[PDB]
Design a protein around this ligand. Sequence first.
Ligand SMILES: CCCCCCCC(=O)O
Length: 178
Amino acid sequence: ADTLLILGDSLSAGYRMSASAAWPALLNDKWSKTSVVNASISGDTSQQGLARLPALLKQHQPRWVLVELGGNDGLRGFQPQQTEQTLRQILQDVKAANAEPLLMQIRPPANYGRRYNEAFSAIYPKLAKEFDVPLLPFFMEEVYLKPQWMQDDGIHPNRDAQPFIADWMAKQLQPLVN
Ligand SMILES: CCCCCCCC(=O)O
């Protein structure tokens, strides 16, 4: 009866595959118990996601909102401060909508500069603490350990990987959606 809104990028929308092939669709099929609305768009930055949020909240009135954004910010001329501030507004909107925000940790490519990487990654733990919300692990950490689940670009998970990502997310979300 309740709805879980997913606000993410290609990792949740699916890269070079249809939405129906993406793990959130498989998760929804696994759950008439809880409705999963996948509001993810490939290439979206935290800012682009924030821009769509207001309409989505008033439209779907979700109980929980999974935030999976930031991974594109670095390649789009953004500084950790900008990303942090953008995600901060996202969490604010969610709470202000009487919904529980579920933040996912994001980690940039190993080759993006320690200076930025450690600063970027630190944004999530900080925000999770600041708002006192669940901080889910970056699901891609488990996917990297299986080349057969990665597309050529070595960045996006493939079709074969979605079913596993779906079960993994179900387990992570289970205690959070009661
Ligand atoms: C190395 C992890 C960061 C990549 C996030 C993918 C972003 C997108 O395509 O929409």
